[PDB]
């Protein structure tokens, strides 16, 4: 019994370790989000099929590695979905022939937030999966440890909703002026969703964000956002009503706002974060 990956990394007879690099395409669902599907990534075969049958299980101790080390979910294994991390062994899978066969494993994540996410840098570990192989021939009992690494930079949602772009860049026209922001949110089922803004306000009224230009900063003007033509203060919650699978626009627009005093010429830039909550 030996295994190998799609890119050729192999583990010989007796066990060992390997690295699996996969492209992540997470998708949010009603009950639990998807992290990675590991079908067609890992292939295992049996060397003496005519007399030995190998029994393969997902051994206890499998869990999420890397930044995801604190999240729990379920795992699809050979017909059902068991709690993850695995505190107990899973049922058997029989490997029967020399021709390589997949080791289909899929990992899901139980939502814990409203619209949260975690940023996965490329080449970063996500999960560790221990494969245990015994047989019906002798005392062989071996461990194959697979380290799953993200081949690309993605954001894994930790909530029930999702957003169109995790980083949105918009450019203002020259002062005075405004421009809409293309940001939309959706959820897997009808949820009473709302959001609020967080940033370094520069006014007593808490409606103007500080200009943090790195080079040649203009003075006397910040950034102010309007929802449907109305000024939104920073930490005042904004209600969106029921949101379903159809994408619902936030309707945000950025404007120029004077912080008082004379206004000079230069660059303007502000950083604004949007946080969603249940209502």
């Amino acid at each position, epitope marked *: 019994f030996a295994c190998k990956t799609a890119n050729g990394t192999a583990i010989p007879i007796g066990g060992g370790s390997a690295n699996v690099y996969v492209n992540l395409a997470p998708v949010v669902n009603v009950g639990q989000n998807l992290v990675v599907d590991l079908s067609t990534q890992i292939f295992c075969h049996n060397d003496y099929p005519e007399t030995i049958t190998d029994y393969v299980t997902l051994q206890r101790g499998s869990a999420y590695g890397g930044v995801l080390s604190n999240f729990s979910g379920t795992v699809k294994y050979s*017909g059902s979905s068991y709690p993850f991390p695995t505190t107990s062994e899973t*049922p058997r899978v029989v490997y029967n022939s020399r021709t390589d066969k997949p080791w*289909p494993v899929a990992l899901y994540l139980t939502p814990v937030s409203s619209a949260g996410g975690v940023a996965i840098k490329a080449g970063s570990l996500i999960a560790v999966l221990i494969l245990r192989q015994t047989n019906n021939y002798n005392s062989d009992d071996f461990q194959f440890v697979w380290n799953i690494y993200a081949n690309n930079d993605v954001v894994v949602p930790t909530g029930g909703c999702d957003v169109s772009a995790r980083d949105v860049t918009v450019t203002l026209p020259d002062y005075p002026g405004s421009v809409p922001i293309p940001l939309t949110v959706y959820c897997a089922k009808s949820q009473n969703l709302g959001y609020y803004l967080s940033g370094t306000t520069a006014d007593a009224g808490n409606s103007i964000f500080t200009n943090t230009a790195s080079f040649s900063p203009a003075q006397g003007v910040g950034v102010q956002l309007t929802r449907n033509g109305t000024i939104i203060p920073a930490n005042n919650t904004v209600s969106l009503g029921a949101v379903g699978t159809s994408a619902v626009s936030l309707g945000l627009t950025a404007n120029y706002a004077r912080t008082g005093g004379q206004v000079t010429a230069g660059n303007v830039q502000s950083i604004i974060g949007v946080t969603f909550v249940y209502q």
Partner: antibody, heavy 117, light 108 residues
Framework: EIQLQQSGPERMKPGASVKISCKAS????????IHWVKQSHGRSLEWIGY????????NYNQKFKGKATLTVDKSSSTAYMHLSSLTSEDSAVYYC??????????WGQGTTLTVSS | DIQMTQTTSSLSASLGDRVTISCRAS??????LNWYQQKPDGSVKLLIY???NLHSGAPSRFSGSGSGTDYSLTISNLEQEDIATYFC?????????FGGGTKLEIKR
């Protein structure tokens, strides 16, 4: 809340083919597996197989291999069972069920199939 | 595969009695034993999974226990709603297999 609705009873001639569906609802269809179970007269239960309604991997009981083809329609949240070359011993009740913890979590109401001339 | 046998085809009892139904597996299943109930009209539904866990809506008067190749289901006190057939099913190896069934009678 979680409901699995099936198609009504079917009548077929021997040697024909039947396609019975199972429409799932109340949860995320592609997150779980779907199993098919057969109950003959005498009321013994037999396992046909499962299908993953995400990537379409299947597993069959060797009894029904070459006879039963599990497929799935992802768009409309509908699973299918197909039988071919029907005979007398294919008259039974076919259940569609969802599995969570190594167990058939929820069940459909069943579809009676009569194969006679 | 694994063959599952239930001791008795039928059982007799009266309202308030504490009854037991036991399955036995040919080969060891690392727990992973489930109990289903089929009403006389024909609707199946799960009762207990993984040998000791109740489903969402199963009444509290059901319990399970066992290990190795011997398992059993216990009903604390019969009600009229508990007159049905009871099946056992292993999920340690593919194909999954079922028990023969145990029907419950009212004693008279």
């Amino acid at each position: 809340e979680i409901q699995l609705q099936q198609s009504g009873p079917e009548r077929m001639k021997p040697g024909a083919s039947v396609k019975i569906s199972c429409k799932a609802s109340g949860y995320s269809f592609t997150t779980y597996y779907i199993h098919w179970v057969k109950q003959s007269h005498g009321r013994s239960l037999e396992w046909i197989g499962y299908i993953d309604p995400f990537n379409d991997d299947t597993n069959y009981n060797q009894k029904f291999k070459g006879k039963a083809t599990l497929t799935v329609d992802k768009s409309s949240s509908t699973a299918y069972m197909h039988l071919s070359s029907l005979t007398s011993e294919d008259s039974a009740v076919y259940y569609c069920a969802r599995s969570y913890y190594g167990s058939l979590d929820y069940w459909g109401q069943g579809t009676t199939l009569t194969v006679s001339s | 595969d694994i063959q599952m046998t239930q001791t008795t085809s039928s059982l007799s009892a009266s309202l308030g009695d504490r009854v037991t139904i036991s399955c036995r597996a040919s080969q060891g299943v690392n727990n992973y034993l489930n109990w289903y109930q089929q009403k006389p009209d024909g609707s199946v539904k799960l009762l207990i999974y993984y040998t000791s866990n109740l489903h969402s809506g199963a009444p509290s008067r059901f319990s399970g226990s066992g290990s190795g190749t011997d398992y059993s289901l216990t009903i604390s006190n019969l009600e009229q709603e508990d007159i049905a057939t009871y099946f056992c099913q292993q999920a340690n190896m593919v194909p999954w297999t079922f028990g023969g069934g145990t029907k419950l009678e009212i004693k008279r």
